[PDB]
Amino acid sequence: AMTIKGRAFPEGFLWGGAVAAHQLEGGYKEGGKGLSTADIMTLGTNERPREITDGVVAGKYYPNHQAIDFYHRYPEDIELFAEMGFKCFRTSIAWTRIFPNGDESEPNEAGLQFYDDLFDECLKNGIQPVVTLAHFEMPYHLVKQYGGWRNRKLIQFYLNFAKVCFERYRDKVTYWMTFNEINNQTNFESDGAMLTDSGIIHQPGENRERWMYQAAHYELVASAAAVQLGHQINPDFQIGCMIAMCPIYPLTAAPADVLFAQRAMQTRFYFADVHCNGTYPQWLRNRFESEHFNLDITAEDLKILQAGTVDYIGFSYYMSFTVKDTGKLAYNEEHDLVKNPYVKASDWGWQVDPVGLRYAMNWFTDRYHLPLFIVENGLGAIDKKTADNQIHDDYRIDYLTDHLRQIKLAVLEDGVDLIGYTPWGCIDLVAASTGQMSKRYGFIYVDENDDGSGSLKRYKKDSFTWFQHVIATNGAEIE
Amino acid sequence: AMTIKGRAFPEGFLWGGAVAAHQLEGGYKEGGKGLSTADIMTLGTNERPREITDGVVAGKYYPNHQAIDFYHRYPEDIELFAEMGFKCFRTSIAWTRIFPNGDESEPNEAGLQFYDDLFDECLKNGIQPVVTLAHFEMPYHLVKQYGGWRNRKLIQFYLNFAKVCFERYRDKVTYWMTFNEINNQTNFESDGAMLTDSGIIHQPGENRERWMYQAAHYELVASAAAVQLGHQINPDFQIGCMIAMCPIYPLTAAPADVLFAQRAMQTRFYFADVHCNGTYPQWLRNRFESEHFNLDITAEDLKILQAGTVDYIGFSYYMSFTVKDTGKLAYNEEHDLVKNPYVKASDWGWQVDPVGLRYAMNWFTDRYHLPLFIVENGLGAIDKKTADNQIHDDYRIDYLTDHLRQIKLAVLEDGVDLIGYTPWGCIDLVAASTGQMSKRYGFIYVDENDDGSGSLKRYKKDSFTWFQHVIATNGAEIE
Ligand SMILES: OC[C@H]1O[C@@H](O)[C@H](O)[C@@H](O)[C@@H]1O
Ligand SMILES: OC[C@H]1O[C@@H](O)[C@H](O)[C@@H](O)[C@@H]1O
Known part of the structure; x- marks a missing residue:
């Protein structure tokens, strides 16, 4: 029963922070940037x-x-x-800074120069950029003109973008990911998931689930083609997938609840099966047939998928879900979740379950036997900045500490292969779900309110000093 | 929502029945047979x-x-x-009919001739033998002389036996399995599991768990060496593992219960991980270190394991288990199970959970992507034979029908690759757990009582006609 206190994470561990271009950059038309799908989403609330x-x-x-x-x-x-x-x-590299409309034959030099400048600034400070290519900010022109990822033509457009980035930043970036949280669209009834993952705005009469699977298929093919392309350009690139890992528990030991939760995870994570194993699960191919989807899946596509499996699994972790049997063995995330009565939740309703992250790490390890990279984790919460400009975010420190304890157990005891850990929203930024500044994740407070007002000054929260010390001690004090 | 009624199992599906030599043959000293570990177990009860x-x-x-x-x-x-x-x-081929003491330099011809005669009798009737090499009946001499599978020397003794069988029956047997229910010894406190799997009779002071892992290691190495040897002798052999598949559910959606059930299945099924993936799970290698086992595991062993992964997963299914968190993330099957309140149980306490078989088939498929073969399934139950020699075993028909429905769903809807299905104890035989005749599994009643008395006449139970019709219709009527 040996303590983990005093034992560090592995040597060479990548501590850092994570953001997405559209959530923090601004400058949405600077340098010739095109309009993206992020730029057409107004302010909301929970x-x-x-x-x-x-x-x-x-x-x-x-x-x-x-x-x-x-x-x-x-x-x-x-x-x-x-x-x-x-x-x-x-x-992320903003797709619309490089290919403003998406279908150009040549990239935008001012956009490429911006990322040279940004990455150089990181590297001058000994910080390595880790890049996601698609992160909820595709060109709105591709949505309007082609129907987004409904259209097979987007595979090549994406690859034109990927090729330019891989070549330009060949000597600056080692770790890449293809499609951020590709599996959010598991909830095919979510307008937000469908726009952000796939550029799909529902048209009356369309089969939402069918089109989700078609789009995801093309994205998976594009990812696999990009893994092969990137490795041709630089064989030392590590090119990963990016999965939103919300594990799904059965409510009880009733056999039907257990089977329903198994199918729920198969449904939410088939994307990982394709990215890692290179083949579709047969239950899902059978679903396509029994639901009469008639998807456009070719032999060439399947060959590309098998040849373009990923080097590591990047993932986010925020919460877990629970389900009970509904009477039909098909998971619909918009309707089939129940609140887990054993855990608490954030002010936006996100369940707090650090043990579930240890579960998740074992789940990925035993299924795929690939290295993992936790590229998002965090607590969105209200902060109050004091008169003397302090932010006493003990709630955020507590969440992150509790998750790091479980990560540390998974690495030291369970032997999970973990590349690094980057908390989400390390500088306060615009929330995805709601567009709010008030749903804060950062170690650094930004003085901007939900209505856009404020000085935009940056202030160190108490969590800044906490995380600085975690990094300095390589996580040794976590117990 | 299409019915499965009227849809058959796949063409080429292997229907049959399963037994083990020591449970039905008798003749325990005939033909020069040696004393086995089955021959030193007296009659018990539940x-x-x-x-x-x-x-x-x-x-x-x-x-x-x-x-x-x-x-x-x-x-x-x-x-x-x-x-x-x-x-x-x-x-099974009785190890003690071929190598009576286990360490002979040449096999026993009368034993080899018995299996030629038995297999010929099957083949003359169009029945293909499917053979398990080790099935709870190893030579007692190896237990006494060497300490059973505590001793590395048993790897070669097992391989001498395997080689003889593979060569002799090269043209008679296609499907082979190496070690029956190799994972029963997950319960390292079970005297029965330790003797039957591993030839281990506890010595005072010994660390039971440590020695279980040592023995299992040598058996896994022997299995992997046998897969390679068999394929050299006949590349068309299909050589499988044999796993006792009791799935383990969390009692509730409490995160600690879910993680504990995940670890319980990792513990019970690491054997499958080794047989299929060819490597130990890292959590378990870490356990060996933290429990200070100092196991004898060499680089050569690990090379053999990686090169000798199996062609298919043979498994038994009878029941499922449930667990709740005990406060320590280590599963001890003798103490850590709780009864599942959603299901009923047999008269020997075995939980009846057909849905769990569909779960299990998906679990193996998604983890390993190998074909499966259900080589045991059945209900041990009291039968009453009537005055006119009938046996109205509707309870047994019901159990088997309910399991076949779930199997059929897993094959037709979930797309699981299933070679065949062989109910256990197809002719009434001696129970393993208790040595009772009264715990009957068969389609064929044998007039022998728990004390050995009776005529030994065979009578067809009602389930005989039921299963005959399932086979004739290739399972089409099951709904
Ligand atoms: O992007 C953060 C989270 O957003 C939620 O809407 C999605 O369902 C999650 O899968 C995702 O991790
Ligand atoms: O042999 C039948 C059953 O026996 C029980 O004692 C074991 O625990 C099971 O794993 C096995 O399937």
């Missing part, structure tokens, strides 16, 4: 959904247009990351 | 354990000595199997 508009509508507030102005302020924000001691910085 | 004696003790009744005399009666019993329409017959 109770009122963001509105998805047909382009920019006069008079409406779009939080992603200016965000926190990291497009201009990155030198000073990176200084703060370096003060905390980050080894890496996980962000 | 409440009173079988006694394991040091060799044969005068005056005690050993049910396996004469069993049901299939050693002499096989021609007439096989006629009954052929009348039911079996495609295959799953049995």
